[PDB]
């Protein structure tokens, strides 16, 4: 299969729960992505299926298997279709706006369309040496 793992260093963000951010209230979207894109985007690292019931009975399984990795979001698409990966990558890219340690899941949506759309450009030039969204 094909997997693309978008790492978020949970060691870097102890105060930002990417799990509570990504699959917490929006776990539905992870399900929608696998259902629609054909890619089962699994959050790997510590906290994927961190359910107490799971560590009891579902223990030893993929959830804990990748629990020993660092928290990252992985679009796992089982197929060779490039059209497949294109579909999950766009969806997961919206997650890329989500796995940001931002306090909220907005503002950036508007700011990135406006300014972050073209950060370094003729108007700035030197901003190329230091852009916020590197």
Swiss-Prot record:
Domain KH as annotated: residue spans: 7-73
Which domain of life does the UniProt lineage start with?
Eukaryota
Cell location? Nucleus; Cytoplasm
User: Family assignment?
Assistant: Belongs to the quaking family.
**Subunit (UniProt):** Homodimer; does not require RNA to homodimerize.
**Biological role:** RNA reader protein, which recognizes and binds specific RNAs, thereby regulating RNA metabolic processes, such as pre-mRNA splicing, circular RNA (circRNA) formation, mRNA export, mRNA stability and/or translation. Involved in various cellular processes, such as mRNA storage into stress granules, apoptosis, interferon response, glial cell fate and development. Binds to the 5'-NACUAAY-N(1,20)-UAAY-3' RNA core sequence. Acts as a mRNA modification reader that specifically recognizes and binds mRNA transcripts modified by internal N(7)-methylguanine (m7G).
Write the protein's name.
KH domain-containing RNA-binding protein qki.L
Organism annotation: Xenopus laevis (African clawed frog)
- Provide the gene name from the record: qki.L
Which start and end residues of the full protein are shown? 82 to 215 of 342
